[PDB]
């Protein structure tokens, strides 16, 4: 019985591979050779954030690209004003080991989570102006690795138990459960229309899920090691995945195949955080060599190098308008990088 | 300066002084990571340190020794895959790794886990405190004689008791030889790599002895001192 099912699964995998080969006629790099190269890119540190006590684990930008939220292992969640460097709020965290944080699109709530397996959401617009624990979400049997808001009452969270959950803030209970991963889910990326989200797990796999329906749509296994970061293309028809194999891979939802591979001989360390620009022309990926690399999304060439972090870069975020890029590192310093003419 | 800007500046100053107070509290408190197998007596040690005082995910215990606060963190509910979240503990003061010395069959698993955590990329600069727990059970098992470590570890046949050993006066020499064989087996793995940036502190724990926490205290003190000796390049 089991052998027959395994043989059928192998035959279906072979059929899928044959279909992928048939639908693949030309490489992406072959047709992008006629475009003008981006060239060398140099970015300067416009702002530096200081005040955290431990390593920065994750950060998220606001809708207005003015206030950002930073999470550190010291048990403090700090809101930073990117313009005047002034601190807006310093929320004490009951669990010091926080691995992810999220900022609501409306800016009224902020979420965090980590090894405690509890998603804590605080309201930033209280009547008396004092931050308090608005909601606590429980039910995950693993460390919370990434959380992203969908609206003022719904949130999507991912944990290490190979399971993703959809939480309603008003009720506090799970409404949709996504299962199918074999390794720990590291990060997820929301589509611009908030209809689909693709999440990568620690099995060299990335799966696309529908929030409203609640089942997997496409599965991509082009990587060789655990995928740590994932970002969504602005058009919503593609995404990029970074893994420990020192290689970024671009996948297309409609093509159901990898588009381009970003790797070099001089880089051999893992990839922690990846993100796209406003137009998606450049892919910024932070590595374990204490810096980040900006690659050309089309020609697969190292467009630029962002160095100046004393430790590994843990989180990388790009503003909605693309004004600047915020990179957090384990040295307890968050640096804002931007280009100039 | 605008009135709203001045209000923002004064609020930022209040946040800064709150963060300074939090930093002063944080620097005076040390953090420890507890690791061990399910059959190990980690729960007994946690219970003892909690009672003496001197879904859930992670458990935190606070205990004060010699007017020094220590926060010990234990894994409450996590999967068997520990290759990712362990990186969260790259800045802890010490890692207490408890090993059950009574289970010879699972001793190889403990050795493999110790080697994996010792050679981790993000745990290179973190010292590990080794507790060879269940000493009484190991002594009883050795005295029984039904099972011998030679079958599990052939190297025990050629092993010899170290000259610098300090056995208990009323302890059988065979038990001392076995426990020091286990200790040297751990020490060879610990010294195989590391280059002296981090150190191991193998201690024999009875899972009921009160000194254990104090031992950790002393160990942590040494670590801090060694850290200072690494600031002046004295080691």
């Amino acid at each position, epitope marked *: 019985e089991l052998d027959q099912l395994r043989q059928e699964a192998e035959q279906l995998k072979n059929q899928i591979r044959d279909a992928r080969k048939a639908c693949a006629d030309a490489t992406l790099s072959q047709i992008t050779n006629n475009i003008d190269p981006v060239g060398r890119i140099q970015m300067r540190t416009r702002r530096t954030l200081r005040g955290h006590l431990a390593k920065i684990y994750a950060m998220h930008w606001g809708t207005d690209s003015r206030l950002l939220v930073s999470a550190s292992q010291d048990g403090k969640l700090i809101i930073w004003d990117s313009y005047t460097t002034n601190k807006v709020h310093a929320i004490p965290l009951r669990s010091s080991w926080v691995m992810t944080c999220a900022y609501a699109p409306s800016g009224n709530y902020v979420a965090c989570g980590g090894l405690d397996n509890i998603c804590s959401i605080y309201n930033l617009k209280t009547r008396e102006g004092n931050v308090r624990v608005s909601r606590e979400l429980a039910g995950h049997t693993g460390y919370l690795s990434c959380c992203r808001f969908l609206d003022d009452n719904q949130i999507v969270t991912s944990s290490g138990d190979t399971t993703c959950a959809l939480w309603d803030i008003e009720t506090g209970q799970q409404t949709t459960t996504f299962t199918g991963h*074999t390794g720990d889910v590291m990060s997820l990326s929301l589509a611009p229309d908030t209809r689909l989200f693709v999440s990568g797990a620690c099995d*060299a796999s990335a799966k696309l899920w529908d929030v409203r329906e609640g089942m997997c749509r496409q599965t991509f296994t082009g990587h060789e090691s*655990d995928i740590n970061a994932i970002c969504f293309f602005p058009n919503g028809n593609a995404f990029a995945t970074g893994s420990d194999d020192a290689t970024c891979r671009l996948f297309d939802l409609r093509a159901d195949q990898e588009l381009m591979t970003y790797s070099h001989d001089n880089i051999i360390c893992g990839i922690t955080s990846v993100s796209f620009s406003k137009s998606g022309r450049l892919l910024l990926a932070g590595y374990d060599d204490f810096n980040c690399n900006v690659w050309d999304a089309l020609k697969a060439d190292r467009a630029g190098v962002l160095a100046g972090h004393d430790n590994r870069v843990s989180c990388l975020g790009v503003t909605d308008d693309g004004m600047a890029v915020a990179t957090g590192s384990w040295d307890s310093f968050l640096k804002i990088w931007n280009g100039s003419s | 300066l605008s009135a709203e800007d001045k209000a923002a500046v004064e609020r930022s100053k209040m946040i800064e002084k709150q963060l300074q107070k939090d930093k002063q509290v944080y620097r005076a408190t040390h953090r420890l990571l507890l690791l061990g197998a399910d059959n190990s007596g980690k729960s007994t040690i946690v219970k003892q340190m909690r009672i003496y005082h001197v879904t859930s995910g992670i458990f935190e215990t606070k205990f004060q020794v010699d007017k020094v606060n220590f926060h010990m963190f234990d894994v409450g509910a996590q999967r068997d895959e*520990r290759r990712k979240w*362990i990186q969260c503990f790259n800045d802890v003061t010490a890692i207490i790794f408890v090993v059950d010395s009574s289970d010879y069959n699972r001793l190889q698993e403990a050795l493999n886990d110790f080697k994996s955590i010792w050679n981790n990329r993000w745990l290179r600069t973190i010292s590990v405190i080794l507790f060879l727990n269940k000493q009484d059970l190991l002594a009883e098992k050795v005295l029984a004689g039904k099972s011998k470590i030679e079958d599990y570890f052939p190297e025990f046949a050629r092993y010899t008791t170290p000259e610098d050993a300090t056995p208990e006066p009323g302890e059988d020499p065979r038990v001392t030889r076995a426990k020091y064989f286990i200790r040297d087996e751990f020490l060879r793995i610990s010294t195989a790599s590391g280059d002296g940036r981090h150190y191991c502190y193998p201690h024999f724990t009875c899972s009921v002895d009160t000194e254990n926490a104090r031992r950790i205290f002393n160990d942590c003190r040494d670590i801090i001192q060694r850290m200072h000796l690494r600031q002046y390049e004295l080691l």
Partner: nanobody
Amino acid sequence: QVQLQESGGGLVQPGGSLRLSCAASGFTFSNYKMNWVRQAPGKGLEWVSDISQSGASISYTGSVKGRFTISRDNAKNTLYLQMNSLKPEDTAVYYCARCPAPFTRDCFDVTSTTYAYRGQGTQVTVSS
């Protein structure tokens, strides 16, 4: 897709010789460290032996030390395991596991029961 296929096994008389082969595809074999795991009936996964990228550092567990030999061939992209002087206690299913990360000296979740970077394994029964 990263996959590993194991060949060799079955019924073997005690004290005989056996050859286990593993073919891995979907990744660079020369980059990752290789491990062998065994699952006995009624017992959990236990580490057996490991070989590094270049084969300079090869280690075995104390149970089968001096009895099993593990080698790799990068040109043919394969792994070989020669077993001699088998015992009835060695009746188990063999899995070939890959290091989770490249260019690293530590294996963390190789013995994990839910590890994904391993093959299906083959059954070896040492019976008379």
